[PDB]
Design a protein around this motif. Sequence first.
Motif, PDB file in Angstrom:
ATOM      1  N   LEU A 493       0.887  -1.109  -0.071  1.00 11.56           N
ATOM      2  CA  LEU A 493      -0.127  -0.171  -0.118  1.00 11.56           C
ATOM      3  C   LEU A 493       0.644   1.098  -0.155  1.00 11.56           C
ATOM      4  O   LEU A 493       0.359   2.306  -0.497  1.00 11.56           O
ATOM      5  CB  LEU A 493      -0.971  -0.039   1.231  1.00 11.56           C
ATOM      6  CG  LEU A 493      -1.991  -0.784   1.001  1.00 11.56           C
ATOM      7  CD1 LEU A 493      -3.101  -0.957   2.414  1.00 11.56           C
ATOM      8  CD2 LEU A 493      -3.279  -0.278  -0.022  1.00 11.56           C
ATOM      9  N   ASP A 494       1.902   0.912   0.560  1.00  9.80           N
ATOM     10  CA  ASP A 494       3.002   2.288   0.407  1.00  9.80           C
ATOM     11  C   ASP A 494       3.353   2.553  -1.136  1.00  9.80           C
ATOM     12  O   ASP A 494       3.430   3.779  -1.531  1.00  9.80           O
ATOM     13  CB  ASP A 494       4.269   2.028   1.135  1.00  9.80           C
ATOM     14  CG  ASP A 494       3.949   1.749   2.699  1.00  9.80           C
ATOM     15  OD1 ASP A 494       3.120   2.428   3.506  1.00  9.80           O
ATOM     16  OD2 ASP A 494       4.770   1.061   3.253  1.00  9.80           O
ATOM     17  N   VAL A 495       3.487   1.693  -1.864  1.00  9.50           N
ATOM     18  CA  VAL A 495       3.780   1.578  -3.320  1.00  9.50           C
ATOM     19  C   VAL A 495       2.556   2.375  -3.968  1.00  9.50           C
ATOM     20  O   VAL A 495       2.394   3.128  -4.961  1.00  9.50           O
ATOM     21  CB  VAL A 495       4.257   0.383  -4.065  1.00  9.50           C
ATOM     22  CG1 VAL A 495       4.636   0.587  -5.554  1.00  9.50           C
ATOM     23  CG2 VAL A 495       5.338  -0.460  -3.034  1.00  9.50           C
ATOM     24  N   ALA A 496       1.320   1.566  -3.505  1.00  4.77           N
ATOM     25  CA  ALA A 496      -0.075   2.239  -4.152  1.00  4.77           C
ATOM     26  C   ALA A 496      -0.051   3.661  -3.874  1.00  4.77           C
ATOM     27  O   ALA A 496      -0.533   4.461  -4.845  1.00  4.77           O
ATOM     28  CB  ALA A 496      -1.143   1.481  -3.691  1.00  4.77           C
ATOM     29  N   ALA A 497       0.139   4.379  -2.640  1.00  3.13           N
ATOM     30  CA  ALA A 497       0.100   5.457  -2.378  1.00  3.13           C
ATOM     31  C   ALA A 497       0.917   6.415  -3.042  1.00  3.13           C
ATOM     32  O   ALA A 497       0.906   7.322  -3.739  1.00  3.13           O
ATOM     33  CB  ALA A 497       0.229   5.739  -0.847  1.00  3.13           C
ATOM     34  N   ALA A 498       2.398   5.827  -3.280  1.00  6.52           N
ATOM     35  CA  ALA A 498       3.572   6.513  -4.051  1.00  6.52           C
ATOM     36  C   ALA A 498       2.988   6.550  -5.616  1.00  6.52           C
ATOM     37  O   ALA A 498       3.669   7.690  -6.274  1.00  6.52           O
ATOM     38  CB  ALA A 498       4.777   5.978  -3.863  1.00  6.52           C
ATOM     39  N   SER A 499       2.184   5.608  -6.142  1.00  7.15           N
ATOM     40  CA  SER A 499       1.977   5.707  -7.193  1.00  7.15           C
ATOM     41  C   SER A 499       1.081   6.818  -7.922  1.00  7.15           C
ATOM     42  O   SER A 499       1.047   7.648  -8.775  1.00  7.15           O
ATOM     43  CB  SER A 499       1.042   4.272  -7.816  1.00  7.15           C
ATOM     44  OG  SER A 499       1.159   4.220  -9.360  1.00  7.15           O
TER      45      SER A 499
END
Lengths: 745, 79, 107, 288, 237, 96
Positions: A493-499
């Motif tokens: 979810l950190d990657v999803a938010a950074a996207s």
Amino acid sequence: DILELTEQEELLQFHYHTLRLYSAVCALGNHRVAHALCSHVDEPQLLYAIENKYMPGLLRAGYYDLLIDIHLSSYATARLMMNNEFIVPMTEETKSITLFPDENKKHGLPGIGLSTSLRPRMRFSSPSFVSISNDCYQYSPEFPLDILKAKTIQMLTEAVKEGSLHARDPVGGTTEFLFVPLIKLFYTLLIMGIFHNEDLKHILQLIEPGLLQMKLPEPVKLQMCLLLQYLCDCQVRHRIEAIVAFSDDFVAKLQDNQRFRYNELLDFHEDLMTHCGIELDEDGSLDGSNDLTIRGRLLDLVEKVTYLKKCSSLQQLISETMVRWAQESVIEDPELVRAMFVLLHRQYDGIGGLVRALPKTYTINGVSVEDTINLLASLGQIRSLLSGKEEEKLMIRGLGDIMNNKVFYQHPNLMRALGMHETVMEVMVNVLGGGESKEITFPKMVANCCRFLCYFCRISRQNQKAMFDHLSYLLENSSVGLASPAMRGSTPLDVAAASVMDNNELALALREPDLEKVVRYLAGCGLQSCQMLVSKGYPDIGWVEGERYLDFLRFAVFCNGESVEENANVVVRLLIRRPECFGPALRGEGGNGLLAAMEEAIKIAEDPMGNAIMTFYAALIDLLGRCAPEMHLIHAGKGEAIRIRSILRSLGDLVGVISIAFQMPTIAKDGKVVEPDMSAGFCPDHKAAMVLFLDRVYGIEVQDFLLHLLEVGFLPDLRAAASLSATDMALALNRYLCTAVLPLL
Amino acid sequence: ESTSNSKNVPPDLSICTFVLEQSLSVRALQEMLANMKTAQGGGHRTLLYGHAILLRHSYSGMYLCCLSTSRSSTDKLAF
Amino acid sequence: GVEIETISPGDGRTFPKKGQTCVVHYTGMLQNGKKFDSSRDRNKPFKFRIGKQEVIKGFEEGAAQMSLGQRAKLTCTPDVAYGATGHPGVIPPNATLIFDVELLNLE
Amino acid sequence: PRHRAVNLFLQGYEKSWIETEEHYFEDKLIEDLAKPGAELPEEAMKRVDPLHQLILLFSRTALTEKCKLEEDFLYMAYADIMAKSCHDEEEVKSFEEKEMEKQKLLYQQARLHDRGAAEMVLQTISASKGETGPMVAATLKLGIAILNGGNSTVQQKMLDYLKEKKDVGFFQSLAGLMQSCSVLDLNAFERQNKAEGLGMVTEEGSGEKVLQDDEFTCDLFRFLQLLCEGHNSDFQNYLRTQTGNNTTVNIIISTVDYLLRVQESISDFYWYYSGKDIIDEQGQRNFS
Amino acid sequence: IQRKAIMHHEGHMDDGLNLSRSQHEESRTARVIRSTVFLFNRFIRGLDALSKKVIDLPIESVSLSLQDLIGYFHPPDEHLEHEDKQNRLRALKNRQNLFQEEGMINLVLECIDRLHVYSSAAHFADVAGREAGESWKSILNSLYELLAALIRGNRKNCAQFSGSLDWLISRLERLEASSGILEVLHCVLVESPEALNIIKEGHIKSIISLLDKHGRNHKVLDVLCSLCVCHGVAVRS
Amino acid sequence: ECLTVPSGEHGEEQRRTVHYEGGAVSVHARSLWRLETLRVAWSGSHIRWGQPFRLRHVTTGKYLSLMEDKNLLLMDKEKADVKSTAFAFRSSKEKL
């Protein structure tokens, strides 16, 4: 003996299978196995084995496969993997290359010339067998290359002479055992790049005027097709280098021609193309159609490239031989047919090869050549380890090495062109694919998918857009274990938010079903217990549940300082269509009982967790406040604004939240000297959600409400006055009071 | 397969359903030395008394035949 | 223990110093006539510095006994070997080594 | 000089502007060169034509099912090659030039479909069960190139193949492809016009994202129309019910629902434009 | 999903059995699959009920049924057209899937194979009757190829057989044994990492001791090759 | 949710439960029943809207028979009822 086995069975088969085991146990790259097998079979043994003319075909093929898989198998695979890349540095020799050799310009020899692409490093080692190390890298020692270079071409001339003579006794059994290992070793040596200069000229003189005119079986045809593919790849690389030289000279010429004509109203102000429009917009605009007299060289070199070649070169020979091969008889082994037609289409569509090779081309400066080489070696190691049990440590080392590299953040477009996105995605899929509990749990690939990628690259409207494609897979497998959310709860979810961190276009492009999914995952946490940090059992750790989902939704709904209405509508609708929190003050209702929830949380804080429930509720109300429509910032007339405002106001209870916002469990914490409880207790920015909801929905519409509240943070104001000590509540209370800009209204 | 139909012990019919095939005359014997099939008949010919017939099992896929073996719990010259 | 059986004499007084490399063409074979390693057939001699543990102790001690140009025939007890564990994949555990080194030059 | 983006800017100039010369080249030339009759065997089937072997390879690759259509580049290249070969199409001789063009087109179609080209297209369509990948687009382009003018021979071949093979997945794949077709999607335009500031200032990507695949839908419906052209009525009776197969689907009905969808989308777009004065260029293109 | 008929007198009116087209497609193929499953199940159940310690044990019926089952799961051969080979492979895959997801039989086929308490081929044969004790190799090889072709299609039951790790160790043996099942299992598919990693140091040493004890089998080298990289996916994974 | 007989060693030991459960059992059709007619001559007729027919599972020999509690729970082949095994087909309308 060895030649006695040509008439004795049960020993030829067993020794052939032993050679197969020796080759297979050292497959796909190995370190200890190669050095260990360098003792059982030796360099003079291999030379004599490939030298013998009366050896059985099975043993000949086995020995050739063993030699290839032991001595020359890792660098060949690395070069074959990195062939499609066209990284070219900037050097005086790079721009000194010409597309055609001279003014004769007939065809040009494909392999003969000058190459400057950044190739992987050749480095062998020694077996020693009484030493330390030499195993971790630099695989099985250098079986000598000059004697191999001489002997291979010598007995290849012998083999083609025998084939032209049409003898009834080949070296092995049929002509397949005579030709297939020879052409395999020749192809491996050629793709290694050892053959060059007069040796390659002799090779071309040998296989052209050549053995293609003779009759060959199917595997020999396949290997010759592979050789022709390699030759065409070399020709394409030469064309790419010529393009690099032209685009190095002409870019400077046009840079001068654009810098001198900066401003010498105006002619449409040049649409600010001089300074504010010098980017890829200018590059598309500065075409060779109609601009100055510089386009003469552009058209000249366009013609030079599109002479239909580099009819008049090796293409006509390749096409004629392929047509003859198709005409001779029916062809089985559909891989051979596929390779045949692929090569034919590639010959007839050289412009297709050019337009395929162009996007992956890059021009790196001459000062970071060594760093680029090191990064390329690290990527080669990562791609070799791609698609483990203890290889996870090697992959961690490679990712850490690629972290501390200047080329990563100084050249993000090169990083995207090199395609590490799909490599890391495949690694993560292989790691977490299978279910259960993700046995090899060490989530650094998510940190690399995030972190520098999409932080230092700064998207450039391209990196985050490319990362947005895997968003569905990222949010679908919301695994646990990453240290970024302190304890477990959300690794991807950190990657999803950074996207979708700070991209308004990507936030608008977010689909409703993904938000519906995330809402369902948030609603899945409909449980409560008295354990410390339990999820399904074993309350061991006593040190966030849906807070990560709420943070992701906050990042998705609020981009820059602005609140996306289209996302906010569906977010608030799906939030009110399924209540999430368990508010005991409401009791009868689904939740959102903020009157007593925070009181119960602060009571249980000093009891046998703690900030978890308060942080979850704060994240919820912060998401709701950022989800509120902009009060007269853009629209104030009507239409889906007062509607959402009234819906938010209905949750009466939220109208009066003064007893929560201006509550006084302020806690001096450090106070005189000690007890600075960071872990347990409300944060100074915990009331930032309160004040954000107030400003977004209600605000100070009149001074009567301000006088009723008097001082907003009255007890926070007293605490700030008493802070006149440091290294305590004051450090974040200063930021909390600085965020209280609402007096400036 | 005994079939009494007492509504309590059903019979089986799959093992009994036969499908017949090309019917030729006795003078149409085929096997002129060697002969695959290469049949020379349109089909749906009605079987007349004396025609040589072929039986095929609708389930087992095989053909009912007279085995070259003997015995079969019998004591005679029969097959 | 070193059990040197010299087959050909050399200088007679030359001994390898601490900061010197023993250029040899060893062809050491395991017992029962098994040639596990050969440095001559690779057409590349062996270099190793004395006193830096770059080679096995038996090879270092055997080189400290032969003279310059002295053809030697050494043996290695399991004490000066790869130990009870042995070299994985090539040397069986608890085995002895036989060396027939021939120092070409000393540097 | 470090940020020499000219190497990528020249890609836009070289991808299509210079590709026209090669598009005018090859295609028919290589198509007729690689099929010179029965070759030169100098010896029943005369060792089979090379493109016959190629079509057989494609057909047997499509027959080897894996519940997912791959992304083979050879299919792309050669489907485009045959489509360009078979689609060579003021006041001219109404009975001479037209007849000569028709005869040339019929000759090219006969050369292509005499080696089982219809079976390849039919099997490839039946393979992808509703997946709207580019392979289906290339296959439909090849199909409309084959059926240009509505040959009775190719229609008869496809009909007898579908009758003898009892292919049920073909019609299901067609229904799925038509169900997955895009629409005007006014909400996409509403989100698009609220771009960075006003208009496409950032110019990051000129993708449509409002009408996804109009070319694919047009090609599919043109293929369906050419499948029943000439009032053959055998396909028209077969396509309605498929009485030979166990499963019956009505592609006519699904076409009616797709017409309903596009009609509703166009009406919604017009009513959103209602009350305005001047049609913008983007709305003009979407309406067209 | 778990319901019942019930419905005394009149139940719920919104109830109708929608028939499915099982005629054709499945048809004769699925019919004989079900009938063969029935016959084999009944016959081998009678056998293992009779096999419980020392009516006489059938032998000729066992051989006939085994030969018929071998002919039922035969490979489709290579000297045929591509479309016929593909149709035969699809039919065989349907055969295996309907043999597996239904009454599995393969689990109690291993129960039939369990009677290795004889270990002599002379004493159990004459205490239990006449002959037998030698055609067990036919059983082992035939249903080994059955399991191989069963997994070969679309990753059917690699984890189903890998879950019998104790019985995998039991199959790991050197006493009148054929290693066909191990070779085909290692060749067909990795699936979960168990099928390529439960072979521990003990298993490798026992196979190596099988090579050392018996002669040069030349087939153990093939499975040892397959115990290395299998499909190319074992690129240091 | 088609009629299903349990398996995985549950069958042939209990062999009575008639599970009304669908799922992967559907296309991997263990749930298959072969029907037989009382008449022998012209047994395989086109079948009118109503006529009795006995039902037997293709994998288990337990004939489908009805009990007194309005439930089937199967029965052995050698023990079948005269009216609880007929299973006359029903036309489009109820009430006989």
